């Protein structure tokens, strides 16, 4: 009849086609209030001082400067070395080194070995 | 270079002793006049540079670094005395005595004509930068990215000091006029592979080297305004200055030695640009901008052509003022926000019109926009590395498809969009910002005009 | 005066449109059929191709073998 | 449904108060009080005065330098008369007319 | 087109390849073929700084419409009968042009009936 | 009429 | 200021095609409630739009005769 | 000769005279799109006589 | 902001994880973190992946072109998910039926400009002759030496 | 270009609308005609309602205030609202 | 609100109206021939692009 | 789903909506007026058929697939309101709602070109001033505890009093400055 909708990573399900929006249980409800409940509270105490005639300034949020830390001061002190980041330490960090070694080489070696021979078309060429 | 010279040290009794309301505008007054007088320097000759002494001489690459390094201090000063207004009356002196300190060195450091006193100025360069960083800085991070700071540079360099005395020892001489006569060629050896790398180490550092640049995004960011101008303007420049010093000496090993190092700096060009495009710190945006734009300078003194060499001391000169520029620019919203993040304060155009169109013409010459001579340096560097090898015009091309991407971003994140509506501290454009962003733009296009004054020893 | 607006019903139309509007539509027609006649060969063809096939084999030089 | 008589008294006072809001932004006819405050000039000044600049630096220092403006050289025909010399050029060869 | 379909769809041997053609020799079939002669002088077409597409054997057409041209500035209808002229020969060229595939056309289906006329008898 | 106002950053400077 | 609704009796679907949408709702057991809404996009200036070959034929009557007198008119020059 | 080039450069320059008059601002202008509008008019008839002498 | 309010490691113990989901503002039962393979995450939560454009765009959000509301964890990638960027909303069309479509319809030109290239048209013409040696001064040939006669005949 | 909304105008022309609607007789209306409890009007109509008033004023009311809206000087306030009409 | 009685608009459709009436023309005869342009081809072949566009 | 007073969608409020979105994806599809009229009553039909479904069960899984109908049967490209999120002028003008906020960044030589405008927002200012101790102790002495629930906010509870938290409703941007 109808084709099922495949969601990829670049592509999610919709909401209207997910079966988990469909649950009329207790818990969801609870989950569902809980969350409402948690973002009314932090609603409130942001427009508690974005209304405030006194405060002249940035409203600073902790989640940005919590992003920021995590984005940048946070990533050593919680790295540990083991098999998956030594490989793609490895993989990504001297593996394009050894290709892009490799190719430059090999094109400039059959360069020279054009240009000592009197093979390339090197006439007009007086700017390097 | 002691009419330099002389001026420069005056500058510390003349702010030693100014009335406490008067260390600004004197030291910004007589430093403008020193800068006046640094255009006398472009006496500059076809065939012979100009040798003023047994110890100082300037040929036509010194010269704009020169005029860039006494241009920047009345810059420096114009920045840093906002966020120093509040600050003690001697330590206000001590800061202006370490920037005053800082420009005495590098003028005889890009002035040396022996290459041990390079070394002695170029390693005294550290001092006032490191008490600026780890002193005046902001946060707490200052005193370890002083420490990254001070022990890249002499872990690259005390290998130059022996280098340089080995070759003090062999020749009889570190005169660069001397060792431009009396240059022997650099066989194959394992002795002259260490003698190359000890000569070349410490300037890749000083570039920085992509893999060696890990002291930049920090010493570049957890500085005051003047520290990072003269860090990213003046002090990256020691490196290429160096490099085209020291070369000279290293012929025909470079021929192979250069090969992982333009590895190093033609795939470094591409992630550190790269890593521009997701930085949520704005400076260390630019600091890794700094650190791609210095890797097409390491490549154009590594293939050692006359176009390379050309290119890359345009693009040192182009790079010194869009950089100290975009520096001043993100200061300029830090004075306002008190935040690095670039995703706080958005659609800064819709309250700071001026200061955006300094944004986008800042911007435009970061992606290297003709006619400017950021285009010029770029542009030769594109034309020497394609006579290097054809293919490498990929590595430059897709570099300058994300140089462009993270120039507009940058322009579109912070100065785009919608504004950030709990922020309301945003006051309208001093006339000390305004004209910073004047004097750090306006010579980098008047200097389209005459590119070559700022083309180096072999235009 | 200018054009009111009006509400659910064909607008206020100007003389002027009008007469422009038609002005051009026939300065179209009258240009093309103006030059339809005075050119006639740009749209159907310019000289006649010839067919091939009824050329003789004298003139082409072939020997009858 | 619709809306509950909490939501209908806070939409409604922030109505009135956004219709004041909206009221005073209004003008007052003196307002802008402003502080204390040849037919075809284009022609001159945007035209014929840079056609004199352009003029004078194109005819006194461009042309005087070589190469600087370089003009592919004029068409020649048969039958034409060269303005230099006087040096007539031939018609060409008699036709073998087609039609 | 349908010359398409009797090279590609058809057998190809036997129609002339546009590329390498003629593989005749210009006698062959012809006592005494005379040349195409060359009206505009080499030196007239050169001062006259023609397209170097535009030097073929009508290129006097085209001299004299450009000095038509030149010398009726600024009424630019002035030379339709020049232009027209030069049109024709240009399409006296394109007849001479369909003249010579299809006499490379007729000798390939010469050749095809010599060859079966061989193979039929020996 | 009814000339309304323009909230504007602060031109001046 | 203000400005005047007309009448709101007079968008009626007769002579319409939404009393054609109304038959084939009703051949089926349907009313429909939003028709003389619609009703003004049917009627007055708007009703009678032309075709495509009459939008492509605007300005050929005056052109066509404009080129008659035209061909008249240089026919009868030449001579 | 001298008019084709000298018509030529004063096109471009016209264009770039009112770049100057928006940079050198002090006034809320007379109506400066008319202004780059008879610019642009003078521009096209300006760039017309070397058109015109290269159909000739 | 104060240390304990920052990120800091891979919670193990079940109040650890509590504690680090009251401190991202989010339920223990929402909150999973980036799993502990060390790549550097440490507590931060991994939330769902998903685009801001995907949100709900009349919603009373605190910042409106990101739609993200005050205090809300922010994604590892929200300088990613901005709508300047990579947008994973729904598609009408598959996504893999999008590419095979996309894929199949590029190949297919590339495949026939091949096969016309292969078999070019053309017109039943001879080749456009040209006089003078088949214009061999014109073409930059030397005089000083001397072509082989090109000779064309009448047809 | 664009004459501005008025509270009369934006009354007229939702009253308007309703007056084109079957399932409302023009005489019983009124601006605090309620849809379900004085019109007797179901929900799939107070939606179809809610979008000709979409279609009449050339703007999009979200579901979340479009399903509040249970009178026309509910409507008319919210496109009031809106359009920041009586400045 | 339909309206388009505006000189600015009238005048700015209307220029580049005669321009898309006559440009053609006084460009391509005002042109030089810069190559020889094909005006020999069979009937269908002449009336493709029209026969197509048509279509 | 994400809404800010309410924790969920009710099956009615799932329906509507449903409802609107399959009238508006069916008008794109058909763009004639008498056409979409026609179809727009086929689809009230087809809405109408299963109205009086009293077992929740059923009426939840014909949702469902109703839903899958409306995935399969839209337009690509469904019109979009122009000033609606997706449309061609949609948030067009936020470069020009400059907050109020920097009118207190003006000089005074600018400040006095609107002597009036300035006079009369200063008894804004001082309205918001006197009035933000009342809504806030309103808005502590009615918040439960454990913090609000919903996001609603209550109105002025008293005569004289401002609503709690109103000036960036109020002193919002125009939608055409
Ligand atoms: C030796 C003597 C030399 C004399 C001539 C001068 C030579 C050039 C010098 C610099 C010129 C530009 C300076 C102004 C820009 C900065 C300030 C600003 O934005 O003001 C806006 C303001 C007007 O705006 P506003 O409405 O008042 O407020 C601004 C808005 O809020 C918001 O603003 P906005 O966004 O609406 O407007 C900004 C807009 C934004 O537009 C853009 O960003 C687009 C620009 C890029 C694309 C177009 C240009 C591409 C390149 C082609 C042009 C160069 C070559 C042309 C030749 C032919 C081809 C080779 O930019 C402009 O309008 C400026 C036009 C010129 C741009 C130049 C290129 C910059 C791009 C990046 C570098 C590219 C290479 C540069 C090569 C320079 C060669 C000289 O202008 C002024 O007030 C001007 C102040 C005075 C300027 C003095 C300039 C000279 C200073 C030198 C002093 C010492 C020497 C003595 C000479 C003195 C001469 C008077
Ligand atoms: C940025 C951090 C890394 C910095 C790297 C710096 C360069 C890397 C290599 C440095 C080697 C040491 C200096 C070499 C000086 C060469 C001068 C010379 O005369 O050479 C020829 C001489 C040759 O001897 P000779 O010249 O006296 O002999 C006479 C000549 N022949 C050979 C013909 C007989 O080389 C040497 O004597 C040894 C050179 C290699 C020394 C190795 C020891 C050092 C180990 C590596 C240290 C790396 C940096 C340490 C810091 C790291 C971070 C904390
Ligand atoms: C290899 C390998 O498995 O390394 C893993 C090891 C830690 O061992 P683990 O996997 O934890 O047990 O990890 C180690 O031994 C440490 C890392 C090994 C060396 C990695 C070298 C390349 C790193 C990136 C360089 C980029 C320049
Ligand atoms: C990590 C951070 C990012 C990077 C920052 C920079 C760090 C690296 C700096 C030094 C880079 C390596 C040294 C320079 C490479 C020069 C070319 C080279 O050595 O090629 C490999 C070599 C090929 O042999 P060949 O060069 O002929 O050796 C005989 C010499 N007469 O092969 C051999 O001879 C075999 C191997 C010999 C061992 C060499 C050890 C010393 C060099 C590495 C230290
Ligand atoms: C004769 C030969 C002809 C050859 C032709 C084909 C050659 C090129 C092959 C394909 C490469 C280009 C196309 C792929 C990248 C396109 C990126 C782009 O434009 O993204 C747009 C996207 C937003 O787009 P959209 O969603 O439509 O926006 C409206 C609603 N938001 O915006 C974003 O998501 C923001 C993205 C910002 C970061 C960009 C990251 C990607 C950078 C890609 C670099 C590619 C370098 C290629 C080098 C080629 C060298 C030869
Ligand atoms: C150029 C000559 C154009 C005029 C001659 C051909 C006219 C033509 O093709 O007419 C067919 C058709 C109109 O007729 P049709 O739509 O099929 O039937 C309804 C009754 N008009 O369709 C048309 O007339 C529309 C196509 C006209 C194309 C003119 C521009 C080329
Ligand atoms: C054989 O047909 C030679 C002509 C060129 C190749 C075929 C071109 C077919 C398309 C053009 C004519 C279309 C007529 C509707």
């Known amino acids: 009849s109808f084709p099922k909708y495949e969601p990829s990573r670049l592509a999610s399900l919709p909401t209207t086609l997910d079966p988990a929006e469909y649950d009329i249980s207790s818990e969801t409800r609870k989950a569902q209030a809980e969350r409402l409940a948690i973002r009314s509270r932090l609603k409130r105490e942001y427009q508690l001082q974005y209304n405030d005639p006194s405060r002249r300034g940035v409203v600073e949020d902790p989640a940005l400067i919590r992003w920021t830390c995590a984005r940048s001061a946070n990533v050593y002190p919680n790295f540990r070395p083991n098999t998956k980041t030594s490989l793609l330490g490895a993989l990504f960090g001297i593996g394009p080194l050894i290709f892009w070694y490799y190719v430059f080489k090999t094109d400039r070696d059959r360069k020279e070995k054009l240009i000592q021979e009197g093979k390339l078309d090197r006439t007009f060429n007086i700017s390097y | 270079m002691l009419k330099y010279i002389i001026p420069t040290m005056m500058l510390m009794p003349l702010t030693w002793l100014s009335k406490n309301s008067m260390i600004w505008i004197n030291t910004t007054l007589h430093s403008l006049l020193i800068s006046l007088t640094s255009l006398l320097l472009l006496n500059q000759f076809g065939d012979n540079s100009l040798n003023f002494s047994l110890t100082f001489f300037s040929d036509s690459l010194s010269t704009p670094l020169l ?169 990256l420049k020691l490196g290429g200055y160096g490099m085209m010093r020291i070369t000279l000496l290293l012929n025909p090993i470079t021929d192979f030695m250069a090969y992982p190092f333009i590895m190093l700096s033609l795939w470094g060009m591409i992630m550190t640009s790269s ?33 390379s060499y050309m290119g890359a001391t345009a693009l040192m000169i182009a790079h010194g003022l869009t950089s100290s520029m975009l520096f001043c620019l993100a200061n300029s919203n830090y004075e306002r926000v008190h935040s690095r993040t670039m995703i706080l304060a958005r659609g800064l155009q819709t309250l700071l019109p001026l200061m955006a169109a300094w944004w986008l013409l800042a911007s435009l010459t970061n992606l290297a926009l003709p006619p400017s001579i950021n285009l010029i340096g770029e542009l030769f560097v594109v034309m020497s590395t394609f006579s290097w090898s054809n293919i490498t015009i990929i590595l430059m091309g897709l570099n300058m498809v994300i140089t462009a991407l993270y120039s507009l971003y940058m322009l579109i994140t912070t100065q785009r969009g919608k504004h950030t509506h709990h922020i309301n501290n945003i006051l309208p454009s001093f006339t000390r910002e305004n004209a910073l962003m004047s004097l750090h733009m306006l010579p980098l296009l008047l200097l389209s005009l005459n590119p070559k004054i700022i083309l180096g020893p072999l235009y | 005066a200018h054009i009111e607006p009006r509400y659910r019903q064909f607008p206020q139309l100007t003389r002027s449109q009008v007469i422009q509007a038609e002005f051009f539509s026939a300065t179209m027609w009258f240009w093309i059929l103006w030059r339809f006649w005075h050119d006639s060969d740009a749209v159907l063809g310019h000289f006649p191709y010839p067919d091939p096939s009824q050329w003789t084999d004298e003139e082409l030089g072939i020997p009858p073998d | 449904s619709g809306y509950t008589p909490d939501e209908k008294l806070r939409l409604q006072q922030l109505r009135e108060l956004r219709r004041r809001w909206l009221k005073d932004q209004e003008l007052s006819p003196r307002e802008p009080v402003l502080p204390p405050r040849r037919h075809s000039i284009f022609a001159f000044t945007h035209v014929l005065i840079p056609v004199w600049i352009i003029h004078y630096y194109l005819k006194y220092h461009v042309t005087t330098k070589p190469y600087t403006i370089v003009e592919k050289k004029p068409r020649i025909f048969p039958g034409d008369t060269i303005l230099e010399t006087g040096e007539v050029i031939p018609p060409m060869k008699e036709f073998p007319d087609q039609h | 087109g349908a010359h398409l379909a009797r090279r590609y769809l058809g057998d190809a041997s036997v129609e002339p390849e546009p590329l390498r053609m003629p593989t005749f020799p210009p006698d062959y079939g012809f006592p005494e073929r005379k040349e195409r002669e060359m009206v505009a002088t080499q030196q007239e077409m050169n001062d006259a700084q023609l397209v170097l597409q535009q030097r073929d054997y009508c290129a006097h057409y085209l001299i004299r419409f450009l000095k038509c041209k030149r010398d009726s500035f600024p009424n630019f209808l002035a030379c339709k009968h020049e232009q027209h002229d030069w049109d024709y020969c240009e399409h006296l060229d394109y007849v001479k042009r369909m003249k010579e595939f299809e006499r490379e056309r007729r000798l390939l289906q010469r050749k095809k009936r010599r060859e079966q006329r061989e193979a039929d008898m020996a | 009429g009814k000339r309304l106002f323009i909230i504007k950053p602060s031109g001046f400077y | 200021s203000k400005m005047e609704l007309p009448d709101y009796k007079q968008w009626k679907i007769e002579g319409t095609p939404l009393e054609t949408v109304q038959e084939k709702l009703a051949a089926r057991g349907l009313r429909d409630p939003w028709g003389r809404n619609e009703a003004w996009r049917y009627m007055g200036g708007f009703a009678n739009n032309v075709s495509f070959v009459g939008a492509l034929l605007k300005g050929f009557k005056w052109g066509f005769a404009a080129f008659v007198v035209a061909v008249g008119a240089e026919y009868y020059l030449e001579s | 000769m001298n008019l084709f080039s000298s018509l030529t450069l004063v096109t471009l320059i016209l264009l770039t005279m009112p770049i100057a008059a928006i940079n050198f601002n002090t006034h809320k202008f007379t109506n400066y799109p008319l202004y780059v509008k008879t610019t642009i008019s003078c521009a096209f008839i300006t760039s017309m006589i070397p058109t015109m002498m290269f159909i000739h | 902001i104060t240390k304990d309010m920052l990120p800091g490691p891979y919670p193990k113990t079940p109040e650890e994880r509590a504690a680090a989901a009251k401190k991202y503002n989010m339920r223990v039962e929402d909150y999973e973190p980036y799993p502990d393979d060390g790549m550097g995450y440490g507590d931060y939560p991994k939330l769902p992946d998903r685009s801001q454009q995907e949100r709900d765009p009349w919603y009373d959000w605190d910042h409106p072109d990101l739609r993200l509301n005050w205090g809300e964890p922010m994604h590892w990638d929200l300088d990613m998910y901005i709508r300047n960027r990579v947008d994973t909303s729904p598609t009408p069309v598959n996504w893999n039926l999008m590419c095979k479509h996309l894929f199949g319809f590029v190949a297919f030109m590339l495949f026939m400009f091949w096969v016309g290239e292969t078999y070019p048209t053309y017109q039943p013409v001879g080749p456009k002759q040209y006089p003078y040696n088949n214009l061999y001064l014109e073409r930059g040939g030397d005089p000083n030496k001397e072509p082989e006669p090109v000779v064309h005949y009448e047809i | 270009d664009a004459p501005p909304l008025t509270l009369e105008g934006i009354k007229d022309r939702v009253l308007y609308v309703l007056k084109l609607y079957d399932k409302i007789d023009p005489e019983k209306l009124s601006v605090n005609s309620h849809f379900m409890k004085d019109l007797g009007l179901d929900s799939l109509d107070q939606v179809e309602i809610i979008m000709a008033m979409e279609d009449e004023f050339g703007f999009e009311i979200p579901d979340i205030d479009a399903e509040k809206l249970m009178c026309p000087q509910e409507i008319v306030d919210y496109i009031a609202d809106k359009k920041d009409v009586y400045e | 609100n339909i309206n388009e009685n505006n000189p600015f608009l009238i005048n700015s459709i209307k220029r580049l109206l005669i321009g898309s009436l006559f440009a053609g023309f006084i460009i391509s005869n005002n042109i030089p021939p810069m190559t020889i342009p094909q005006m020999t081809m069979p009937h269908y072949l002449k009336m493709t692009a029209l026969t197509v566009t048509i279509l | 789903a994400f809404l800010p007073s309410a924790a969920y969608l009710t099956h009615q409020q799932k329906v509507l909506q449903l409802y609107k979105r399959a009238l508006r994806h069916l008008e794109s599809r058909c763009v004639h007026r008498d056409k979409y009229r026609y179809f727009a009553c086929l689809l009230r039909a087809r809405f109408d058929e299963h109205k009086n479904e009293k077992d929740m069960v059923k009426a939840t899984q014909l949702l469902r697939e109703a839903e899958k109908e409306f995935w399969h049967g839209q337009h690509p490209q469904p019109y979009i309101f122009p000033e609606s999120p997706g449309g061609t002028s949609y948030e067009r003008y936020e470069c020009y709602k400059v907050p109020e906020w920097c009118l207190d960044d003006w000089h005074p030589s600018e400040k006095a070109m609107y002597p009036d405008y300035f006079a009369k927002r200063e008894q804004w200012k001082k309205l918001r001033r006197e009035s933000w101790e009342r809504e806030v102790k309103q808005l502590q002495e009615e918040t439960p505890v454990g913090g609000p629930r919903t996001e609603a906010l209550p109105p002025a509870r008293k005569q004289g009093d401002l609503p709690p938290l109103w000036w960036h409703i109020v002193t919002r941007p125009r939608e055409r400055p």
């Open chain 2, 67 to 235: 005029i860039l390094t006494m241009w920047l201090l009345p810059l420096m000063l114009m920045a840093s005395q906002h966020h120093l207004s509040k600050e003690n009356l001697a330590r206000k002196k001590l800061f202006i005595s370490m920037l005053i300190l800082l420009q005495l060195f590098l003028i005889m450091t890009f002035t040396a004509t022996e290459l041990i006193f390079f070394y002695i100025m170029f390693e005294a360069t550290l001092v006032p930068t490191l008490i600026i960083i780890t002193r005046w800085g902001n946060q707490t991070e200052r005193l370890n990215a002083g420490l990254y700071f001070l022990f890249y540079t002499l872990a690259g360099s005390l290998p130059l000091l022996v280098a340089l005395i080995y070759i003090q020892n062999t020749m009889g001489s570190l005169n660069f006029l001397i060792l431009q006569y009396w240059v022997q060629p650099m066989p194959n050896s394992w002795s002259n592979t260490f003698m190359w790398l000890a000569c070349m180490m410490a300037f890749m550092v000083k570039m920085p080297l992509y893999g060696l640049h890990l002291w930049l995004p920090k010493a570049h960011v957890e500085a005051p305004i003047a520290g990072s101008m003269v860090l990213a303007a003046i002090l």
């Open chain 2, 275 to 307: 890593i521009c495009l997701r930085q949520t710190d704005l400076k260390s945006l630019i600091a890794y901008s700094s650190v791609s734009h210095m890797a097409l300078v390491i490549v154009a003194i590594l293939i050692q052509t006359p176009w």
